[PDB]
Amino acid sequence: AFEEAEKNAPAIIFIDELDAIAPKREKTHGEVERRIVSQLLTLMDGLKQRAHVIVMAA
Amino acid sequence: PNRLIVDEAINEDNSVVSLSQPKMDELQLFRGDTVLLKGKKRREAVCIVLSDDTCSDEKIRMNRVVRNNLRVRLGDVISIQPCPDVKYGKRIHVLPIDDTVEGITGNLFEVYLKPYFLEAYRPIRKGDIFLVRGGMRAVEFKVVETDPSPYCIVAPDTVIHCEGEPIKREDEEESLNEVGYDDIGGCRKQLAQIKEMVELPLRHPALFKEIGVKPPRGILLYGPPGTGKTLIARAVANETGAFFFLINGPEIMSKLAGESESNLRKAFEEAEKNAPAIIFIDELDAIAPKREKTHGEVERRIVSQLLTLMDGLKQRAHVIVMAATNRPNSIDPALRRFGRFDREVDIGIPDATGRLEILQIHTKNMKLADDVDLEQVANETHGHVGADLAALCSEAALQAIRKKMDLIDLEDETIDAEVMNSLAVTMDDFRWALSQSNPVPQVTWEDIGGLEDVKRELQELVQYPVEHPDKFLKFGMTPSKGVLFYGPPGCGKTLLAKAIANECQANFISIKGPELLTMWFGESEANVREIFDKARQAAPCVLFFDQLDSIAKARGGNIGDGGGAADRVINQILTEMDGMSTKKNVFIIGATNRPDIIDPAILRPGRLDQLIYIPLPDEKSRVAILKANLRKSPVAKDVDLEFLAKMTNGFSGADLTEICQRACKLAIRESIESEIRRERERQPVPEIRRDHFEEAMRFARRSVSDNDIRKYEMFAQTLQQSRGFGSFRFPS
Amino acid sequence: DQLDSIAKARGGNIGDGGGAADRVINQILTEMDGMSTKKNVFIIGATNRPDIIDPAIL
Ligand SMILES: Nc1ncnc2c1ncn2[C@@H]1O[C@H](COP(=O)(O)OP(=O)(O)O)[C@@H](O)[C@H]1O
Numbered sequence: 001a002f003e004e005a006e007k008n009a010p011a012i013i014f015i016d017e018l019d020a021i022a023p024k025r026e027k028t029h030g031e032v033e034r035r036i037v038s039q040l041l042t043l044m045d046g047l048k049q050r051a052h053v054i055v056m057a058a
Numbered sequence: 059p060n061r062l063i064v065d066e067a068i069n070e071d072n073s074v075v076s077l078s079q080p081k082m083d084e085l086q087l088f089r090g091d092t093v094l095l096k097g098k099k100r101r102e103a104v105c106i107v108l109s110d111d112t113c114s115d116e117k118i119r120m121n122r123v124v125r126n127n128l129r130v131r132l133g134d135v136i137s138i139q140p141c142p143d144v145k146y147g148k149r150i151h152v153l154p155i156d157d158t159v160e161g162i163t164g165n166l167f168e169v170y171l172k173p174y175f176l177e178a179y180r181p182i183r184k185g186d187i188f189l190v191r192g193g194m195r196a197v198e199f200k201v202v203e204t205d206p207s208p209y210c211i212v213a214p215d216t217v218i219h220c221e222g223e224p225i226k227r228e229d230e231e232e233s234l235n236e237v238g239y240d241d242i243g244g245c246r247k248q249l250a251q252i253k254e255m256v257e258l259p260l261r262h263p264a265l266f267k268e269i270g271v272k273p274p275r276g277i278l279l280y281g282p283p284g285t286g287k288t289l290i291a292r293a294v295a296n297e298t299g300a301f302f303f304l305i306n307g308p309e310i311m312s313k314l315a316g317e318s319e320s321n322l323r324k325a326f327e328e329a330e331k332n333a334p335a336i337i338f339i340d341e342l343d344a345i346a347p348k349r350e351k352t353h354g355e356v357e358r359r360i361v362s363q364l365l366t367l368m369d370g371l372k373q374r375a376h377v378i379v380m381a382a383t384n385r386p387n388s389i390d391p392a393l394r395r396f397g398r399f400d401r402e403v404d405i406g407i408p409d410a411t412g413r414l415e416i417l418q419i420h421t422k423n424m425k426l427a428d429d430v431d432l433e434q435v436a437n438e439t440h441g442h443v444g445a446d447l448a449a450l451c452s453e454a455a456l457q458a459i460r461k462k463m464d465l466i467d468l469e470d471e472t473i474d475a476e477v478m479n480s481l482a483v484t485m486d487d488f489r490w491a492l493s494q495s496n497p498v499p500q501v502t503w504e505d506i507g508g509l510e511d512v513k514r515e516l517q518e519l520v521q522y523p524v525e526h527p528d529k530f531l532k533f534g535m536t537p538s539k540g541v542l543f544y545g546p547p548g549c550g551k552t553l554l555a556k557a558i559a560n561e562c563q564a565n566f567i568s569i570k571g572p573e574l575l576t577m578w579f580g581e582s583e584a585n586v587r588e589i590f591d592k593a594r595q596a597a598p599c600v601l602f603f604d605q606l607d608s609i610a611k612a613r614g615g616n617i618g619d620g621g622g623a624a625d626r627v628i629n630q631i632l633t634e635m636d637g638m639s640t641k642k643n644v645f646i647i648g649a650t651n652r653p654d655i656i657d658p659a660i661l662r663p664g665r666l667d668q669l670i671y672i673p674l675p676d677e678k679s680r681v682a683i684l685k686a687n688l689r690k691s692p693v694a695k696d697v698d699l700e701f702l703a704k705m706t707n708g709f710s711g712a713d714l715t716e717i718c719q720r721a722c723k724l725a726i727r728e729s730i731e732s733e734i735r736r737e738r739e740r741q742p743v744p745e746i747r748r749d750h751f752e753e754a755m756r757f758a759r760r761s762v763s764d765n766d767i768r769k770y771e772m773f774a775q776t777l778q779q780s781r782g783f784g785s786f787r788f789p790s
Numbered sequence: 791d792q793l794d795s796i797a798k799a800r801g802g803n804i805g806d807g808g809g810a811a812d813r814v815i816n817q818i819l820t821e822m823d824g825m826s827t828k829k830n831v832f833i834i835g836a837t838n839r840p841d842i843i844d845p846a847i848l
């Protein structure tokens with residue numbers, strides 16, 4: 001998803017029901033959930049707005 | 059002598075540098091010699107040294123291209139040393155920057171490189187960035203390969219070729235964007251502490267080795283988010299020559315278990331290779347949370363392997379680790395055991411001057427209006443964090459955009475450049491952002507009327523010693539911290555305490571007597587200890603004890619059920635005041651309606667030595683009280699305060715305040731009825747009249763009887779006789 | 791400091807925390823002199839009213 005967003009610019013990312021994929025890591029009881037949350041944070045940080053992609057989370 | 063201040067160039071090109079002739083003699087440098095220049099972030103450059111008569115001794119004249127080469131700015135410190143045995147180049151490869159050649163289709167060699175290197179013998183180094191004028195636009199190049207390496211001389215027979223894939227713009231932009239610790243502001247005390255803890259062990263391992271002490275294994279930084287902990291770490295790393303390696307916690311946890319172990323092992327090995335090195339682990343609590351509060355063995359083994367590697371630091375390779383965390387407690391205590399992250403550093407909210415510096419640094423890239431002032435913005439932003447300040451600046455910029463939406467045409471595909479450059483962020487945008495963005499007693503002495511002797515006593519007692527600590531040290535007498543006020547109720551004793559605390563600009567804590575009594579066995583003394591500890595934490599502070607007669611009584615004279623509890627409370631108060639004797643700044647003030655039952659141990663010098671009697675205000679004090687009461691009231695001139703004061707000789711100040719409030723309320727009612735009657739007659743009262751004054755006076759009554767005054771004056775007389783001695787005179 | 795607060799003549803009143811004040815004195819008595827080897831512990835008390843102190847303490 002993020003690769004396709006950065007490849008075609010400008011691009012818009014909508015994450016519907018963000019609380020489902022990324023709840024508080026302390027609340028989570030699973031390693032996979034923590035990995036998904038960490039990956040989401042990493043992809044937030046990796047974007048540097050050169051392609052000016054915008055992400056909304058509802 | 060090698061260290062020199064960076065200075066602007068006059069006629070220096072990209073291949074020459076200038077030094078003063080006496081400094082050349084000191085450094086044994088000849089004109090035309092090639093030298094090796096070292097800058098921040100392990101940046102190196104080579105140029106030809108020349109003599110300038112107008113150059114300062116401690117400064118070196120340096121142009122913008124070489125400044126970008128060494129990642130240093132005007133005023134920075136660089137080191138210059140001779141660079142011997144620089145051979146003629148055999149084959150050099152240079153590649154252009156993408157943004158410098160967009161639309162440039164001509165032969166780069168003939169247009170730019172050949173005239174630039176023609177018969178000049180320019181010294182070059184791998185990775186050097188040099189700008190060459192020519193064609194229709196100046197073009198920057200990067201030296202990617204040299205023979206010999208890394209130093210060579212571009213000779214007439216040196217082969218210069220530029221074919222290949224051009225260097226990506228983004229890779230070059232990242233290095234140029236990063237600069238030293240001038241980015242951070244208001245943390246130079248913390249910056250100095252971090253420098254002392256980090257860079258000195260890295261630079262001088264032998265200095266620690268000879269004594270026998272071990273350099274710190276790890277450093278931990280904590281504070282509220284947005285304080286630039288990663289920013290200050292990277293910045294302090296940039297100034298030092300030590301290599302900075304960054305570790306991202308979400309990056310580590312995004313990796314699958316075991317793979318992250320290999321990644322961090324390789325990171326530590328690479329840091330050991332590139333000694334001196336700095337390891338920064340952003341969000342350490344993320345990778346290594348509290349071991350007990352885990353639902354998986356994966357993070358447990360992460361913490362265990364991290365402990366093994368922390369014990370595995372060489373400390374002879376002069377490499378240390380630092381980490382930044384939002385909450386230090388979230389980090390497992392094993393990481394914080396002695397010998398691992400032993401030195402612990404706190405980063406707080408930036409100060410007002412530091413916040414002003416943060417605004418100035420943030421707004422440097424901003425086009426800023428003349429009217430807007432950053433100082434007042436800093437004053438208003440008392441508690442906003444640097445990240446919140448950046449958000450404030452961005453919000454102000456967006457508000458400027460909103461203001462300029464009408465001038466621009468949002469529907470147009472291309473915006474006007476004239477409006478874009480004429481755009482600026484004014485004070486109105488900052489004020490709008492401040493409104494949108496989110497993060498001492500009030501009584502002044504003019505409020506109080508009279509008691510000028512009690513006034514000067516209070517200033518001399520409380521305000522004076524802090525004003526002249528040197529005078530007290532010369533005299534050698536510690537200031538007293540105890541004042542007792544006894545008088546009829548409603549005479550402004552609390553007002554006096556608030557006034558003195560306001561004048562000295564210190565925290566004010568007021569506690570009531572019966573509030574602390576409670577009914578449990580040890581609760582009362584616990585409350586007393588708690589309020590005294592709170593006064594300790596808020597030092598300097600003024601502690602006010604209202605109704606001291608309730609909380610302190612004669613210990614012997616109580617045979618009731620609660621006599622023991624009262625005695626224990628008095629003993630706790632005495633011990634707490636003995637503890638307060640250590641702290642000069644904390645001040646204790648006690649107010650009682652009747653001082654006859656006060657424990658004599660309380661009245662002992664060193665606890666409440668200064669006894670001040672507050673009597674019923676006289677005529678002039680009463681006039682002042684009435685004037686202060688109506689300072690906020692538009693009172694008519696026909697009303698005479700002199701008669702209103704002289705009539706009630708025995709009324710207390712509380713009665714005067716009640717009368718003034720009542721008269722103001724009756725003026726309110728008169729204005730209400732006048733305005734309503736005007737509205738009714740359509741389908742006044744600027745100031746209070748005397749009539750409402752007299753018809754309000756009748757409801758007032760004498761608060762304090764004559765017997766209370768008799769008792770207070772008798773107690774004061776008992777103290778006056780205690781002073782005695784007349785006028786004490788030494789013999790002869 | 792202020793030894794008179796914790797040490798009293800015992801049996802002063804029934805409202806002293808349901809006999810807790812009396813019970814604290816008895817615990818102090820055993821600690822200062824009981825069936826345990828006496829270490830090099832020196833006890834100093836600064837009282838202002840000594841007449842109310844328990845005679846067993848003195
Ligand atoms: N000393 C400072 N000077 C200027 N800006 C700062 C400073 N400290 C923090 N900031 C701002 O904070 C932002 C980064 O926050 P930071 O504290 O580095 O993240 P974290 O709190 O997650 O470690 C930057 O955009 C920067 O503008």
Ligand SMILES: Nc1ncnc2c1ncn2[C@@H]1O[C@H](COP(=O)(O)OP(=O)(O)O)[C@@H](O)[C@H]1O
Pocket residue numbers: 505506507508546547548549550551552553649683686687711712713715
């Ligand atoms: N010197 C004074 N100047 C102005 N107001 C006073 C003065 N003395 C008393 N008052 C009024 O009396 C009211 C109650 O005073 P208070 O603080 O209760 O005195 P006390 O410390 O004797 O209890 C206050 O609202 C205040 O307005």
